Ligand binder design. Structure first.
Ligand SMILES: Nc1nc2c(ncn2[C@@H]2O[C@H](COP(=O)(O)OP(=O)(O)OP(=O)(O)O)[C@@H](O)[C@H]2O)c(=O)[nH]1
Ligand SMILES: Nc1nc2c(ncn2[C@@H]2O[C@H](COP(=O)(O)OP(=O)(O)OP(=O)(O)O)[C@@H](O)[C@H]2O)c(=O)[nH]1
Ligand SMILES: Nc1nc2c(ncn2[C@@H]2O[C@H](COP(=O)(O)OP(=O)(O)O)[C@@H](O)[C@H]2O)c(=O)[nH]1
Ligand SMILES: Nc1nc2c(ncn2[C@@H]2O[C@H](COP(=O)(O)OP(=O)(O)O)[C@@H](O)[C@H]2O)c(=O)[nH]1
Ligand SMILES: CCOC(=O)Nc1cc2c(c(N)n1)N=C(c1ccccc1)[C@@H](C)N2
Ligand SMILES: CCOC(=O)Nc1cc2c(c(N)n1)N=C(c1ccccc1)[C@@H](C)N2
Ligand SMILES: [Mg+2]
Ligand SMILES: [Mg+2]
Lengths: 123, 427, 429, 419, 428
């Protein structure tokens, strides 16, 4: 706009200068936070120590499954080891006095046949 | 697996003889020695009926009991005489009486132990003894009375193994003794509690089969034993022959008896006669089936009409095709469908062995748990208490060492068995 | 890995002998045990046989019966060379067509010995799998010893599964009336100790021969050759190693949806008599009530798990479009809640038949293992016999006799009733 | 920086084999020895997939798990056989079952510790282990069940490092076991909480890509693996090749996953079997060429990566890349801004002058979960084949515990059709 | 007096390496350090032969720092002055600030303190770093917090690389910029943003480069930076010392961000056309094309304006040239501050990188404007950030490494309030 320069300095390898054109027209850093950076680590250290206290969780549940299975299995063997031999010693006991129940009928057609000749040798 | 044979009494023994010589033919044995025959089967299952001794030799597993010499030296002097091991004969000496008690109590028990002493041998010798069978009369003491004892003493010693008899139910027509009813009722009692199966054989039948069905005028104890002889081969075959069954005798019973009492098979046969009559080859299968299922061809006098078959086995003989057999067998279960029980399902099984009997190209034998057997029992108890009226002949047992109520005590045990078969006219 | 065959009972034994026979043809073993194929030191067919000594190839089997007789014919006709005299136990006296005898009376005595002679064969096995138990349904030792075996095998062997092949019994070629009791007895004690169980209806086999083989009245050894073929098509997967069905679990993980419901229905493809069929046509046979293996009708029951076991010359490129028009022509018939099946098992090994046998050499054969609810038809067709007898105590006393309980009968029929119920309880929603 | 590889299960392993020999070609390695090829690049980033041993030698960083010999002596007997270090093989002996539990609980945990023992000593050997990747089936136990276990035990030991899988989601058509739905649903749960990215791969797709798109009648497990083999080389390349990216694997994940569940990239490929740029592009953005059985139509893209291959002018590349994002502008989300980035490495694959691969985080993946969960509840219904796990020591409701975890992941993908 | 350069982050480092290179050309130092007051403003006369840069280079991978101890220049630094750090920041601020930062910061901070100790009256620091992107945002932020504590008055000038969709790779970018820029801004003094897009743009129009490289872009930024730092390396009046940077450029503590514009970018291949007139180049500075951050200052008000000339120029020319920038183009000044133009002449003709892309020019111009239209890119950013955080988008990676859901809220908060100051400077 054709202006006048306010010459502001000259030295070895240069020259500065303002060129005002049309008047202007009248119109705490803080150190304490090194404890903020181990506040951040306050919550990391918590998170990973929880997908651990929740993971060492899904763990000794595996202990169960793995064994609360085997422990339900032999639960069947030692149910069915006597669902056998206590069904089967109820059997040996059952027949044997159904043999006797046959034989003690014989001693009875027998110790009567005896007493009916001791009655012939008396008639 | 192995079976022994007790054969006691004049009637029991003269059956036994003919039986033995007929089956001895089928396997082919010299009156003494060993095998003579172009067949080769025979000997698979000769094991079962013949304990074999040194040299060549084959000797039956037989015990012959009688309470008097007479009828034992009949066998030894007759047909297949000296075939039986000498001291397998248990002699009698004494009376027989034709009286149950003498044979079951006094003169019987007098022997008995000596019989038990042969059986105990043969059976204890026998490598896997399966069971015994016995033959005898039921009216008359030495058979009916000794045997019913034998069996009672046979069990108890052998609970274990299965028992089995061809017993001869006596008729008012064609018999010797007024008393037989008394005799029978007493053994019938005995049997129904100590045997596992009991082939019923009426002499009423046996005689009737010869005059109604043979024209045979003077029927002996000869031609008449002849039938029983045959019928008995019939029944036995499949424990002694093929390998198309396998016939455990136990299996055989379990599959024949529903109810532990009532093991009273009335038997029957295919063809017949011996002397002046033949068969012009024509035993055809069909005419062989509605023949073994004809009552006028039953070995007990009943009539498997009134009274229904509980179970029924049949076994066929001869190189004939069974592709017809099941198909005739079928047919009769429709042609007479009414008179099988339904409540035991597949209750008539039939099998075939194919090496014919003496003579006869094709033949059939029928085993038969018919509650029409009630017919037989109810006939004998009909003349029994017609005797126990004001207690007639009874006095022979009165003193022999028997009791008042003991007759009645078996009059009753029968009268139950009667109304138990009528109880199985079921639903 | 390994795999032991037990055959108890007259029927079991002969089915056995007639498929160890067919195994032997399939793997090329001359009777004496030696095979001239480079497949032995001790993979492939070692599932079943063991390379014992330096020459022979003994079956991993054990054979038990309570008579001799049947076991006896093995130590008789060539094959006599094939087993170890140890592996065939015989037992003097018979079971007599009666379970009580088989389980309690005559069993007691021999079981200790068998159980241990099995334990010999399991000991020459690094990682044994399971057992195959062949046995007759009805009939004595077959029902009763089998039952006792399984109780015990269940105890002596942990996981180790058990596959049974039962011979469901048939009026026409039986002899035994008491049959039904025996089957409903065993089947009850037996079923909680079993894993999957192939029933084989004698009647249906008798049937196949009378229609498809032109045999007038067919023998036992007639029937066995047929079953021999079927079993060998089932076991086929684990013997040559199959491109599917390659272990006992995932063989059957396939077949049994529910603990109880074991019983798959089998159907063998081209039964045709010497003296060829299209890949399509044979598949379209499997779904034909005639060619079935247990007499029933699955066109009206729902299917709930379906296998197809092919054997021979087949590209899957065929199998598919063949199945496709099994669905657009015939009766689909699927349950409320399981995919629409068809695990398909290809085995390139062409099927061998018994040399002067009844059937001919076939290019391709199919096998269809179906778990349908219509196989309970024969669960009642049985029951009904059992019912209509026990109603009168019929044959009971033979059992109470050997030692059994009046109430143990009640109790087994109780089980089928409840089973017959589960099977009805799997239809629709 | 360095990555190890776990390859477990008959499906997992036979993939792993094909993968390895294809990438082993790209770098050029003798069935045993070292480099043979006129190229020179290869070896910059061969560091990453190959721990090298004495003599010449190169040996993969590989662990092979199975619960039975069978399929391991298939690799050792087959193509690039004796390439993997002898005792990097973890044998099984036992059953596998085609059952999740056996592989995640009983017969699995029985091993496991021996596997952990190889990994621990490859990874601890590894100078800066960046992460592991794993391959395996999802219907069937030794893979889906052991692996889901492996990865659970792999974290916890290595929280730290990032996890990653190519998992093969099974189909009702072309499969072996009635049960697979049960198996999958159980691992889907597992994955969605323990992996950082998971390449979904339907066999429904794989197969379909062969019969609608290849005139190949009888599709093996061979020519079908072939695809995954390829698609896997695609995905990996830029951690293993140029230096125009640099692809931390972590960076790679952070820039691919918005929300910590839902890392379910359906992939895709350019050409097919035994190519111009435009016609390469509008083919990798076609469904008829996706690796999951989806249709990236009903469901919008979250984030999307494509990797291009072949000395070609990429001035054409983004000029076609932009084009898809306008001719298909509706179908990517707005609320993540520059959410479809691409990169180009120029060393082509086995044969094939030009090629491209598409990693795609698309909510249309919900379509695949729904489809399994649909035949899962229809099965857990009257509580079907469940009894094979019942007595294996698993819980009644432990199924419903994963059945629900899934139905969430469905209606989250659905909850990201937002505004 | 003295003056230390810090370059954190892949981007920082390479911008660095490509302008230490250009410093080296300008002051005549052969790579080895030896060259056969003044420019001691940047280098130190260490030992008897060499001329080590007063710099420190930090990154969290090696890789990039590794390239330097490789290609000649390898001879130029002290092995100490390049800190590398094993594991990456992974495109994420949290990681850079809190997780992976913590560990290395105590070391760097101290290795800087070595360089400040061989200096009698140190001035301030120049921090080169990428805006978006991991270590660049995150470590920088932590650096400045700490440099602010360890160094009193001593001012800090930052050169940020405002990130651009076409040549980036990262989606999560925006978050990282808005994050740092928040913690960073109360610890900074004046800050030159550099819009990759705008540079990518210059090359595509002005250099004929089809799809330009990073090392393409860097040579350009190298040139611009070296025209800014120029004042304090040769010493010519105006910007003798860092203090003055702000005094001329920042009227308000917050408003740091000046807009740069470099003059004659023209490509050898055109290197012999009758070169450009003192007038015409000035008349380029005011061209949205030749800008340094993509926006439009023809509509935003200017509030402080510098022209930094370099080369053969008599001020006589400059003037009447400016005169008809007024009577032709858009004046555009704020309510209350003169009408600018503090003009800087430096006689040192501008040197270019030898087989580079641009040519040896006789005269070049540099225009540093503090316009309120540079807040256009403050929003073009924000909007991305907004439209993501709205869905939590990528957040969980952060909460992950250790950060606060609410620390995000709080940074957008700052931009919101800034974007406001920047609007609040128009008229009255
Ligand atoms: N399919 C078939 N069934 C048979 C065979 N042999 C016998 N049976 C059947 O076997 C069933 C009875 O079982 P068995 O094995 O015979 O009797 P077991 O008591 O177990 O064996 P035994 O010692 O002979 O009594 C009946 O249904 C007969 O039909 C055979 O070879 N094949
Ligand atoms: N101008 C320029 N920008 C770059 C350069 N390298 C990366 N960027 C940009 O920087 C942003 C990513 O910043 P980076 O420096 O790569 O991230 P960083 O964590 O600082 O570097 P890393 O150590 O690799 O993580 C993206 O906008 C890139 O476009 C470069 O060499 N020159
Ligand atoms: N069929 C057959 N029955 C006979 C024979 N002899 C007699 N009987 C019948 O059976 C009854 C009893 O036989 P018997 O031998 O006299 O009894 P014993 O005292 O044991 O001799 C006889 O009274 C006849 O009814 C015989 O030769 N064969
Ligand atoms: N594509 C691919 N999938 C396979 C392969 N083999 C099996 N699958 C699939 O994976 C699922 C079962 O995996 P499988 O390998 O049998 O289980 P695993 O051995 O216990 O891992 C089924 O749905 C099959 O369709 C194969 O090798 N390649
Ligand atoms: C001493 C001889 O043994 C006997 O006294 N009696 C005996 C004879 C039988 C019989 C059975 N139960 N008891 N059953 C048979 C049967 C008929 C058809 C199919 C199966 C078997 C045939 C063999 N004959
Ligand atoms: C185990 C091997 O690799 C992975 O598991 N996961 C993986 C691989 C990627 C990938 C990504 N996100 N994840 N992204 C890529 C990419 C494409 C465009 C821009 C940035 C990156 C290309 C290089 N490959
Ligand atoms: Mg038996
Ligand atoms: Mg498998």
């Amino acid at each position: 706009a054709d202006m006048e320069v306010i010459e502001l300095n000259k030295c070895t390898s240069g020259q500065s200068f303002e060129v005002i054109l049309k008047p202007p027209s009248f119109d705490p850093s803080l150190e304490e936070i090194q404890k903020k950076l181990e506040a951040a680590e306050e919550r990391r250290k918590y998170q990973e120590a929880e997908l651990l206290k929740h993971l060492a969780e899904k763990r000794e549940h595996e202990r169960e499954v793995i064994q609360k299975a085997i422990e339900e299995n032999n639960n069947f063997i030692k149910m069915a080891k006597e669902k056998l031999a206590q069904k089967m010693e109820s059997n040996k006991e059952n027949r044997e006095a159904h043999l006797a129940a046959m034989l003690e009928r014989l001693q009875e057609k027998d110790k009567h046949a005896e007493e009916v000749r001791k009655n012939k040798e008396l008639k | 697996r192995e079976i022994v044979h007790i054969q006691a009494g004049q009637c029991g023994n003269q059956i036994g003889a003919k039986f033995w010589e007929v089956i001895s033919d089928e396997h082919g044995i010299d009156p003494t020695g060993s095998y003579h025959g172009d067949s080769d089967l025979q000997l698979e299952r000769i094991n079962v009926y013949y304990n074999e001794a040194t040299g060549n030799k084959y000797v039956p597993r037989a015990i012959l009991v009688d309470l008097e010499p007479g009828t034992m030296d009949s066998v030894r002097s007759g047909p297949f005489g000296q075939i039986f091991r000498p001291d397998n004969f248990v002699f009698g000496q004494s009376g027989a009486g034709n009286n149950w008690a003498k044979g079951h109590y006094t003169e019987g028990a007098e022997l008995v132990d000596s019989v038990l002493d042969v059986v105990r041998k043969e059976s204890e010798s026998c490598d896997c003894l399966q069971g015994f069978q016995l033959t005898h009369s039921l009216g008359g003491g030495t058979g009916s009375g000794m045997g019913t004892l034998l069996i009672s003493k046979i069990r108890e010693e052998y609970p274990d193994r299965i028992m089995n008899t061809f017993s001869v139910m006596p008729s008012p027509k064609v018999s010797d003794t007024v008393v037989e009813p008394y005799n029978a009722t007493l053994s019938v009692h005995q049997l129904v509690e100590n045997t596992d199966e009991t082939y019923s054989i009426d002499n009423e039948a046996l005689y009737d089969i010869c005059f109604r069905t043979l024209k045979l005028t003077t029927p002996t104890y000869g031609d008449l034993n002849h039938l029983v002889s045959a019928t008995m081969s019939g029944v036995t075959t499949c424990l002694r022959f093929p390998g198309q069954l396998n016939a455990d005798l136990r299996k055989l019973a379990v599959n024949m008896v529903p109810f532990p009492r009532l093991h009273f098979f009335m038997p029957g046969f295919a063809p017949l006669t011996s002397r002046g009559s033949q068969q012009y080859r024509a035993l055809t299968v069909p005419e062989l089936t509605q023949q073994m299922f004809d009552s006028k061809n039953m070995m007990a006098a009943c009539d498997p009409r009134h009274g229904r078959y509980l179970t029924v086995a049949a076994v066929f003989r001869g190189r004939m095709s069974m592709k017809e057999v099941d198909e005739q067998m079928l047919n009769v279960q429709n042609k007479n469908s009414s008179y099988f029980v339904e409540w035991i399902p597949n209750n008539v099984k039939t099998a075939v062995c194919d090496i014919p009997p003496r003579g006869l190209k094709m033949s059939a034998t029928f085993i038969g748990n018919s509650t029409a057997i009630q017919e037989l029992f109810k006939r004998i108890s009909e003349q029994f208490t017609a005797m126990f009226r004001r207690k007639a002949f009874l006095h022979w047992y009165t003193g022999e060492g028997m009791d008042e109520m003991e007759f009645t005590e078996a009059e009753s045990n029968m009268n139950d068995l009667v109304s138990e078969y009528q109880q199985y006219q079921d639903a | 890995r390994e795999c032991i065959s037990i055959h108890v009972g007259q029927a079991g034994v002969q089915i056995g002998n007639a498929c160890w026979e067919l195994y032997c043809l399939e793997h090329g073993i001359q009777p004496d045990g030696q095979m001239p194929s480079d497949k032995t030191i001790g993979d492939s067919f070692n599932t079943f046989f063991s390379e014992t000594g330096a020459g022979k190839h003994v079956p991993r089997a054990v054979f038990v019966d309570l008579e001799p007789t049947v076991i006896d014919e093995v130590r008789t006709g060539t094959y006599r060379q094939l087993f170890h005299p140890e592996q065939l136990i015989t037992g003097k006296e018979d079971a007599a067509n009666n379970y009580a005898r088989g389980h309690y009376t005559i069993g007691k005595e021999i079981i200790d010995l068998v159980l241990d002679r099995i334990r010999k064969l399991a000991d020459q096995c690094t990682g044994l799998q399971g057992f195959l138990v062949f046995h007759s349904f009805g009939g004595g030792t077959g029902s009763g010893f089998t039952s006792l075996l399984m109780e015990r095998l269940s105890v002596d062997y942990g996981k180790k599964s058990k596959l049974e092949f039962s011979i469901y019994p048939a009026p026409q070629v039986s002899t035994a009336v008491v049959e039904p009791y025996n089957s409903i007895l065993t089947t009850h004690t037996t079923l909680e100790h079993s894993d999957c169980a192939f029933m084989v209806d004698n009647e249906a086999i008798y049937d196949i021969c009378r229609r498809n083989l032109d045999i007038e009245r067919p023998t036992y050894t007639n029937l066995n050759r047929l079953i021999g073929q079927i079993v060998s098509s089932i076991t086929a997967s684990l013997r040559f190693d199959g491109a599917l069905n390659v272990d006992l679990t995932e063989f059957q993980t396939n077949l049994v949806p529910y603990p109880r419901i074991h019983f798959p229905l089998a159907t063998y493809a081209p039964v045709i008599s010497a003296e060829q069929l299209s890949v399509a046509e044979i598949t379209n046979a499997c779904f034909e009530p005639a060619n079935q293996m247990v007499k029933c009708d699955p066109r009206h029951g729902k299917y709930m798990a379906c296998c197809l076991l092919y054997r021979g010359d087949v590209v899957p490129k065929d199998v598919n479009a063949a199945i496709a028009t099994i669905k657009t022509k015939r009766t689909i018939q699927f349950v409320d809640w399981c995919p629409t099946g068809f695990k398909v098992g290809i085995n390139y090994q062409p099927p061998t038949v018994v040399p002067g046998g009844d059937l001919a050499k076939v290019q391709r054969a199919v096998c269809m293992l179906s778990n349908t609810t219509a196989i309970a038809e024969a669960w009642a067709r049985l029951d009904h016999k059992f019912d209509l007898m026990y109603a009168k105590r019929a044959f009971v006393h033979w059992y109470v006799g050997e030692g059994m309980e009046e109430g143990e009968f009640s109790e087994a029929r109780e089980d089928m009733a409840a089973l017959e119920k589960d099977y009805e309880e799997v239809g629709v929603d």
